[model samples]
Target: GEPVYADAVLNGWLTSMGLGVEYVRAEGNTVYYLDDEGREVPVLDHACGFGSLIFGHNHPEIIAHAKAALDAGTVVHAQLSRQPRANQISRILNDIMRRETGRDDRYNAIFANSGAEANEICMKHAELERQERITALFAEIDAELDTAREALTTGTATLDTASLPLDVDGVIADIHRHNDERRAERPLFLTLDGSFHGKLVGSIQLTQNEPWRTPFTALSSPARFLPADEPELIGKIVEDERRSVLTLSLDKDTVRVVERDFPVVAAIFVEPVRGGSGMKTVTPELAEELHRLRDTLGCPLVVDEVQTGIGRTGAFFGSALLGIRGDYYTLAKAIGGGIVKNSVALIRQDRFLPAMEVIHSSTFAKDGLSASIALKVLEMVEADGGRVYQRVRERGQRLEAMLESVRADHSDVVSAVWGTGLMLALELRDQSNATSQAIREKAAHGFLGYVLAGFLLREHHIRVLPAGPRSGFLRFSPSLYITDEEIDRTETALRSLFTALRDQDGDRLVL
Candidate 1:
């Protein structure tokens, strides 16, 4: 064990302070952290209450629903019983997706408790689809093989089947198993570098961090990790494998089209903006390139909108902004109306398998309580007349400008400013042996982000977050409900900190 400590504090040493730090209460973007003398120091939560507390902490509407539920003796969990709320929740999400994408209703929802579970569902769906395809192809091949054997027994084509045992199903099973083993390479899921799907055994493979995943590497899926910008490489990977075809027929046009639509990869899994990857935005060019593969492959394009969904990035889903049309969408965090825990793995109706209905089950995944709460939240978001999105766009620009101003004023400490909508980061000029983005003026890895996070909290009185494993990048994911005044205050803190940082550090600024 690496010196495992059962620390006295609940959040461990990360949230611990010598004098002690605690948030006693939170109310709409304002956090009251307890001070040494039991004083409630108000803090502007730029971390957007950890991105889960949408519309800030405990919005009136959310609180109202919560209170009403408490009074009505609402059932917390629903077992095998049919849930009307779950049905309504599904309807609400589909409606929203159609409205945002300007596409006809295509997705069918599968409920889960968190982003990881949702992703597991998506991954399982891909696996199931691959199985189905393999079975279908093998069925045709099996039939052909049977006919060929029968013909050989009658002295027809290449082989003698007279001595062959009449174990038809067994032979078919062997062939099916062999094809599955060989075709397994084709359905290998494709994920980008610097991505975080979730912490579950299945989803963790999609996540790019080695340290976190090393122990569970045994269960890691056969996944290809590619650069965010490289889509052509994907096609090349499929081509190099040289093993994708979807035709038992030999008709020229029909065969060609079937070959074109052959499932080369299981799914293209992506986070529109790799939020966990230092807020690295996948540009439109790359997405457009991938969309080409989308048209060609029978495999699903699964979009993980766990961080970027539910109005976090101006749009309801950031995938749409990146010109993404996913066959499966994994949603969570804010989808529960900042009150309940819920997530969904939605597959386009055409791609969805009926057999999946009973394959995966979770006890508390789509509990009635979360469904009811989420339904209300969706109703409010839908009726808001796009006001929330408008606010997000406006506020995001303002925050971007503020971050840019800091980067400009203190070029030595701040190297770059990047992010989209309300999800943003301030990358620092590395002073140590941090590497990842590049040697200098690139996204970095190490404790620089952690150091700056400490600085912001201690000096600025603002609670922010350091991008996980993304060093030298200070991230901000404030609620859309963050006020203009609060943003100005945050900007002021950054400016003051930037100046203080320069004055305190000599030349290269060693941490």
Candidate 2:
């Protein structure tokens, strides 16, 4: 008899790939697994908990604080009451945002349990705001109709009404019919082609991967995907979604047709650094275009910083580095300091609706334990006038240079090396050309990245994984405190792995 779990299939697959070792302990950028003799073997971890361990696993100070909080009877489940720690974390995040954007406007923080839930909260608020705008438009039309009816009843109408409906009831009914039809139009969301926001019911539509979305497509509103590089096309695409509604003109005492370009687009979602989509960074041109479009389209800009925030890209918020000020921001991942699970969605003060305060609530959100940990994470990253971020920049430069050297030496095998700060990737050339038929088959089946990761783990004792929806690209997101020696080990391992691939040494590649 044996125990069974939901991830049994995934575990079996990992075992087949020689990546099924049971890790018992992890610290900083290393994790330990037990060998045949029950001896601990350390493995250099470059995956870094899928960007959740930026402060590194089990940070000593953070863990100590958590332990102390538990011993001192810190509140953990006081849900519908005053949470001073949550308020403090919100203030700290607002201060950091103000410094980054150089704006006096404030953002209202909404707490959620995970990154996906945070995104869901933002999406829900966005649609609510859009509905409010539509309501205002209807109010304007109603006021204009009242004026028109007054003139018609008094027989003071100055314009021709020969083809128009003279009955006031008929005109009102016609306008109501038009408004009803417009209300039936579903809200549309705009996202990039390779974006990965989250995988919730509403948020999954914003994600672009086919397999993840196809099964759940019927559960949510439609999302339109545009190219992240060609942001100039955003205006045209939004303009083409013109919706016409009927409004009354008091001057002419006649009903008129008006076109609206804002009602359809709920919001535009973008990731400053696409962590799950091949680690592609947003360009300055695209960022500027999104900023301009925000004003012209009257839609909010939602910058998803789940993976790139917490000083991962040499800055607190990745969008700040590119000059993109978001109306809404979803932050998660390293905000928990690799300890607790917490996320937040910040809505710009002007755009935030007061009604959302009562509408969105979760049983586990805004707990004192997670909030205190998040505050400490912010404090640690901001300590010493922010020296940690500076070190991240320097370390990133050194790491990038090493990766570039590997690419230069093995140009025939390594195709590209790109990213910013500690968020980087090494893309291999198509493995379908390998001399070994087994390697070619794996490449065709989109499992070549897993095979290469297994080889790195077994032979080099380095733990890295493939990135995004594609194969042949391995992402590197080690901790900010990683030493040059560990970085050198990564570089050496990558060089050896690619050298084997170039030489078609299947014995070393295939497990």
Candidate 3:
């Protein structure tokens, strides 16, 4: 009991429970081993958090690189100063991004430690021109105005604005319709529904999730979220948005223009692939539409690649795999090598004005240790024959297929499996099947699928995680070096698992 192996303790505590409900120890390229005390121990948010550990724990190459950096006697901190090595890391990122985008002239990179902070900055950048825009919106019954309106309409159903989700497209159309004269003179910064930009006032304003906002609606920037899933509406919404922007730039042109140059809506805060919460990938066509819109509308696209960057999805970043381009790129989490703690902000190489640097500066903004390790990781990722880099595609593909199989067979419990590389998740198509909801209605029976999967630990020691808000979804994001044999073992475990659920004593699992 005192020195029980992590896996042993986990299986004992959760003999019939799902993966994360128990405990985990150390991670390898694609597998995790149990650690009791002396050999190894338990830790969370390890190595790039998930992305940071893409190469598995204590990778020899990474260690060697880090050791070399330390041995070289390179200065760790020069005091509130930008370091040369940090710039070197940035150069590597830009090169990787260039390879990803194909066109070298389009975008640039920025470094940060956390995804949330970077997102906040992106929102700030998007709204940096707010003072120049003259027109402001007060919803006739907007959620932003709902608190006051709800008080005013006390007798009218208590006016629950929460029920009416954000309609970003509608928001844009309304803005255009209301500011007919100002459209031509100003531009617009629109957010997409289900985005996890960050917690900063500006970011929360654009995000649709209520838990983060509502209490503190102090965002100075105007936010309108265009929901995904409605393709037709999006096409129309863009046309409408363009019209409104044109109007603002026409009548309010003198007022909206930033220093009489950058448009009011100079940039759009976007997640190349929305992760952390939704774990969703935008359709290729939609991503293309946005890329085209930037050029067509003469605006910049600020793609937040924070969560999806750093090989979690097998792809280096979300934008590259989708072939989507952006004007600015932000990186965090794993990209810092977990040693340097860095973040980067990219600009179009030619378009980056010198004044941009003058406006922002940070002490310890650059780190040599972090840069060296990250540079080596980047090299390993690009190297075709390396162990971790070589197997990412093969393993990711196998994992994706496994998720899809679970989805098809367990229609009620599993929504679908979607994602690339080491970041796949089993999305519960039906919310009712979600662990959260099911716990309330059918605690004893609804988790049959979960019970089945849990057998991996009880019988085989394999581990996995759950998608947000629901254990119904089982995410399989093994390390980049996960092997084919391991995939086969995982599949076998799952097959036996479903078999148990189906045999759950007559109608016991039907609830």
Candidate 4:
């Protein structure tokens, strides 16, 4: 039986556009689908499970490891007990973070079921820390008031007439007034303009896409969207939205009122590379500015690496390449090696609260099976002194060059080429000049990229997709094992497609 709702509608659309194919098997960088004559047609998987198949589909070693775990009856349902595999995974992750950032600071891992859950953990912990800080501040003020009242009643010291009056009740009243006023304002979260953290109720608030986030805006905290390239605006925005808490001091037995800044801005979220909005890598200047803001504003910098981590960008962590040290990091997708669903949030050891372990947890988060597979993935990627990352860098350069050559030959059709490592994309120019009414209409409705994707799948045996909704850009996020032969085939196919479009050939493009 076919799915009856969203999946069914998507299947119908794909079938109509000639992009529908039921993959029977997948290995390495290829997936096979059965043709009408019962022949297995292998398609090069450039989408790479939307960045989850970094080691490629059904990696032999990963499969063997998982099979062995299953045969050995690995504990997949253990909770509230010692998880040695999860511990080892965290140790390796901490070591990698130290190696990449050249810092000894440790990160405490909180396991989850998916990338969105990992980010949601960060959001909850951040708010918890903020509230705890506020409580601590109130404690300090209460102690000061207690001392002032004691001194006034016991006549231990003379009251300063020039300072605030010795009426401790009046000071307490003003303090409560300030606290009430500041508490009325909701905490603000800052995220990049083209960011896509996750689709969960809380994480979606941080995502920038209007259609995905607008409906759920009332369900979560407010997030302010900022330009990814502009770091100078951060301080001004924080200042403009600042809230203050009440503080008290003793001035020669007189209780004095002081205003202290509150943590109204919860956290600043960023993606080292904007995967959702056409693979825009964060600029070095913006990265440095974020570090500065983290120091000056005393806010945490959360780097969302669900798509860009695990050597996807030719590095263990994309933020390492840009010299950005995150206070909180989220890992997912390729971390499971396309075999299991798992994610983890790494919070700086100092910022981690033990209560989170009791409050935030899932039944399947730290299971032995996913933990073992994730550990193996880390081992494989880190094997032979990180040779795989080097290969990814080399392959990225070759693929980038091929896209650049196509852009040079068909400047009118290929508008731009950008991205780093194996994650690259080419933006197509507007198709208003096309001879086919179908092409023109698709372009107007933002389905031109899908048409190109369907053409590639139908004619070239290549699997690719548009970067985002209503986007004219096609992103290539293939596996790290993508070979030179596959790269050449992609180049030839892209060249042929561009040539047909250049000549305004409607029959070839309409599929």
Name the top lDDT candidate: 4
- State how far residue 327 of model 2 sits from its true place (Å): 0.9
The lDDT, on a scale of 0 to 1, for candidate 2 is 0.84
Candidate 3: residue 100 Cα off by (Å): 3.4
Q: Please report, as a residue range, the 10-residue window in candidate 1 with the lowest summed lDDT.
A: 251-260
Pairs that collide, model 1: none
Error of 4 at 326 (Å): 0.6
Candidate 4 per-residue lDDT over residues 242-272, each given as its tens digit: 7777655666645456667777878888888
lDDT of 1 at 111: 92
Q: lDDT order of candidates, best first?
A: 4, 2, 1, 3
lDDT of 3: 0.56
Residue by residue across 417-450, what tens digits does model 2's lDDT show?
8689899888778878778887887788778888
* TM per prediction: 0.85, 0.94, 0.69, 0.91
Q: Which candidate ranks first by TM-score, i.e. highest?
A: 2
User: Which candidate model has the greater lDDT, 2 or 3?
Assistant: 2
- Model 4: how far residue 87 lies from native, Å: 1.0
Candidate 4 stretches greater than 4 Å from native: 1-6, 143-175, 246-258, 431-436, 504-507
